[PDB]
Write a protein that binds this ligand. Sequence first.
Ligand SMILES: Nc1nc2c(ncn2[C@@H]2O[C@H](COP(=O)(O)OP(=O)(O)O)[C@@H](O)[C@H]2O)c(=O)[nH]1
Ligand SMILES: Nc1nc2c(ncn2[C@@H]2O[C@H](COP(=O)(O)OP(=O)(O)O)[C@@H](O)[C@H]2O)c(=O)[nH]1
Lengths: 427, 427, 422
Amino acid sequence: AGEIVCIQVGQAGNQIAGAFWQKICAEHGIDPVNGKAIDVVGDTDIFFNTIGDKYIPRAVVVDLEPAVVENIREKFGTLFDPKSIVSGADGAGNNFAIGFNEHGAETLEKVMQVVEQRVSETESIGGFILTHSCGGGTGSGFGSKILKTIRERYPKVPIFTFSIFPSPKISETVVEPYNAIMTLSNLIKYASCSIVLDNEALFSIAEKKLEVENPSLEDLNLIIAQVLTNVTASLRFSGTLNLDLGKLVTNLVPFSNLHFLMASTAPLVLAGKESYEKMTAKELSAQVFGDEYICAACKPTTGRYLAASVLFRGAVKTSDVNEAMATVKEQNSFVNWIPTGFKISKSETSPKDSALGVIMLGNNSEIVSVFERIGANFDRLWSRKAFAHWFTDSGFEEKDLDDARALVQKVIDDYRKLTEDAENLYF
Amino acid sequence: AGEIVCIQVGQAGNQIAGAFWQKICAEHGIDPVNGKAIDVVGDTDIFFNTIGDKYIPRAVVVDLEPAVVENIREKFGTLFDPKSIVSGADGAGNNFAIGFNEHGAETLEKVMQVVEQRVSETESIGGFILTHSCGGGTGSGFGSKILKTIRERYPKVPIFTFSIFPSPKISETVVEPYNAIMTLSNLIKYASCSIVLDNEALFSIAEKKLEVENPSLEDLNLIIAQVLTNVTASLRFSGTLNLDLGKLVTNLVPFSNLHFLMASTAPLVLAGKESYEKMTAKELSAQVFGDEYICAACKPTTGRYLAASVLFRGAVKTSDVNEAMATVKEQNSFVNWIPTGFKISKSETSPKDSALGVIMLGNNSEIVSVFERIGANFDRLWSRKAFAHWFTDSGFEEKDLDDARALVQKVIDDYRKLTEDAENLYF
Amino acid sequence: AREVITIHVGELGIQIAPNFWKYLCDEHNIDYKGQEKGKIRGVIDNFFEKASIGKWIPRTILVDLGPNAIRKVTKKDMKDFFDPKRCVMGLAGDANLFAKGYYSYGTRFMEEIMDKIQKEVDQTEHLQGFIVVHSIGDGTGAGLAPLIMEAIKKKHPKLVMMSYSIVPSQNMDCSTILPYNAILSLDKLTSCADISMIIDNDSIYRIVATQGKENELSESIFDQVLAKALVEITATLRFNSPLNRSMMEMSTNLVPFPRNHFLMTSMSPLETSLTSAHQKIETKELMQDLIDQDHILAPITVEKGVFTAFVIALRGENPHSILQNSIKGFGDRVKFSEIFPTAIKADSTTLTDEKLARSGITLMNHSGVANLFQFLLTQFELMYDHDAFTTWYYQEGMQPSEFEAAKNNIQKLITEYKQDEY
Ligand SMILES: Nc1nc2c(ncn2[C@@H]2O[C@H](COP(=O)(O)OP(=O)(O)O)[C@@H](O)[C@H]2O)c(=O)[nH]1
Ligand SMILES: Nc1nc2c(ncn2[C@@H]2O[C@H](COP(=O)(O)OP(=O)(O)O)[C@@H](O)[C@H]2O)c(=O)[nH]1
């Protein structure tokens, strides 16, 4: 019933999702380069369309790039069905306005036809997952139009977006803050939940928690993929009690515009028996809630939580969960009105490279610092109108650039006001 | 009285049967390369014709190959009587149609004369055992004509066939599905029971249950031979209460076209004291009924049983059999109409490399998955008519290829319908 | 003994003969005079005729429209081995034209050739088939080999016929009319042979040069590699192998449609003298080498095209559990159509070469053959459309529509092999 349709938009979107699909295929027991399997485990129907002995991942692959199909065959074999891959003609040169306005009506109609076919092979739609990168030209503008279009066709369906935000210190292109704000404005309006990730945080993790020396994006994507595979464990491995995407939206989002979540996982293990059997839920909870495993450039132990959820995997003792979470409640800071704090869940099936593991998600007021940095960079460039012609000559009015900024500021102000008011909601 | 005549057809047939004969000669106390013995144990008359001090295995050795006798002397010494070996002239190039149609009338007449002589040296015929491989050109087509011919001459005699089916993942030749379906069609029409074996399952067993590193077919054949020696223990070692081939057909086949059985044995021990004295019937039953010792690419713990039989060897306590089988009945799934489920037997004589051992056979609805994969591969090739000229230019009509497929589908549909109906036969 | 008759046609097929036959003589422990040298091993009868005396006679016929390839082979390179009554010699040669080999000159020798073939056939109770070794370059090879093949198929229709077609290089073996003879003769091989192996001399030259980058080799290495590939293809027809047991089984394993019979090969270690000193080639490396670019005797990358059939024949101990992991490990480098299972078959037979731990060869039915055909066809069209050198063929009876027919047949063949590419 809780069938998931993934949408992958742009180069980052496809590489991250690619790593995810190949890890999913390892846990369920499917060949990552063929889709062919004889003996599989878990509820494979949530993510794969099985025809004969081939498990076809349910995904819509989208680009503006002229040769997206060949670019996939070369890395992912025949795992993805070519009928689901939508190729483009020219491309968006890191310009939100091209991905969003000047993309071609036909390109979008084909994406929608593919989505309709994928939702037509389901007894029910459990939700959509969008994987993309906010500073690009297709994963930002086209991915944003797709969220708009999907939410208009399928309102009341939980959309989760996983996206890469600018890094806190160094930036990629000068245009990046314009692409990032307009992408964020559309995430604010259309996603049910958004997971904020960035590369600076992930690199520190790759260099300090993984054994890899001099990691590249290929290694960095295994941290993101690990977040994605763990967050879908309960869905994939069922259980009498479990978590679907609609359970996460209901429990983590207290207001409709405060859905931006942080993510953290531990242990991080590269394929092979390179891990150590710590086997302790208490240690994993202490780690997942520390600042060192957070996959975004923020410092959550200094903020305040509105809500959080923790999913434990493997043979975790009930007694250790209760004690470990008691420690977490004592050490961290929560807002009074939400009085229960957490959503807790367990899935008895172990991740393939560790007997135990933990994934945590949550609403931490600290997240505004990511948005505030983006806002400030935009304001300086916008005031001087540097690289601005690239957006207004591609269909935007100054009004749209200003309204997108205003919406972003509204979310920041709402998170901050709530957080400051919170100090006295206890007296 | 229950004398057995074995028929070995084709290269796989001869190698598998060869391993069997050499293991039988170890348990009874006969020289495996001479046939000569002074002191033997057990009822050797079931499988050997004793002349003087030489024990001559009762087997008909059949090939289309030009030098089958020399090929046997080189590996089996003088254990087999050359008068029972039927050589060919050219050979069947992995083409069922050559083994079945274009084999030479004389070749078949000689095989039948040899069979008649072997059945003429018996006070009674207990049954025939055919050993072969479904994807070959002689063990498929010629072996199939032999089943037809034997059943026409000796109706009402239990024929057991042991055969190798295509492996679930990788295949050998492109023609393999045509050879496999026509062979299966003839097994459906003429065998009393058929044991379905394949190499993918056997390799996993050889690599995980045997200590051998990098096993070859020579090692793989010792798993098949172990199934064959254990299934004939009660016949060979007598006992007041015992199992003949006619007891197995009566008890395991509820309908005339649902005789395809799975086989499983434990422990698997290579010659030498490399085993451990687990000595527990409970553990052996738990193992034989698990999926890890099944010698075919199927997963029986997820299906439903129509019937099953278990033969215990060695000093097994009655009390442990009853408790062990109670566990099996509770854990597995059976169809209601057959209300007693099992046929149980014991033979007090130990296998040579272990004090205890267990062999299990049974009708598990799961078996259709083997047949369904073969069917589907055929349908795709057959629709495109790839390598088809090789069968129609050798005497088959499209009608025969289509009728063979139809018979196979009938068996699949009957197993599946029965299995699905079964869920409500309990209410 | 299922006996095979080998026919060498043209200057190159004959040039190869001494290397091919010396390998067989050493492999089965026979000297080059046909005398036994210790214990005879393998099914010797399949390739050698037993004399009324202790001598073994190669079961073969040598055909040359001139006198010279034969004279050098039987008088200087392998004296007293070949039976002179099985040699057919003309006087004029072929002027490098297909037309002489197939229409104007070579036709007068067909009574002689078929008479010698029958004399050879009459000595054997169980004839499995014929192997015709020929160049597709020069007129004698390109012309007569198909003329001979048709004459045999019309007389012995139940036998399997295999050809070993050698494509000349664009450098050391080049000719200004190579594209005409290659297309005109592929057109006949298409209906003549049941199995047709294609070996590309340009691949041999670059492969050997690569292996030889560390040394001075020998000029004989190019011929030894070409001859060895045929010897290895035939190993399973000489030893009691669990693979390609007979020519009929090679046909059923590799050719799904009557026209799609053109096969590619891959070989490792290419030659014993190329791999000396420490050559412990583990079962694992041997199978990776066999799908490597530097072991394929064609301008083919396995990753770029589609397989229809694939058989790997190894020699020496090769544990099956390794062979299966090596095949699974091919991943998407070895890919077939969605209408086929990945029918990759592998096993091993007897080793005779005391210097090698193991070895192997593969037979592939792969769409990449279409690329060689298109290369040659494009060259044909550039010349044909502007009448280059056509007078030389018209002067000996090749009415122009004959060229047009070959052009169309090959374009259709290319189209058919590439069907799965689209
Ligand atoms: N974590 C991660 N980040 C990536 C990857 N590829 C690109 N990025 C980030 O995504 C940003 C936008 O990428 P881009 O190539 O312009 O995407 P597109 O124009 O929307 O297809 C880059 O500036 C990088 O910071 C990846 O594989 N993984
Ligand atoms: N388990 C087992 N399988 C074998 C053995 N030999 C061959 N096989 C399998 O049997 C299939 C058919 O064999 P084949 O040599 O063509 O037999 P034939 O043509 O009927 O004599 C092969 O493709 C293998 O998968 C063996 O010794 N034991």
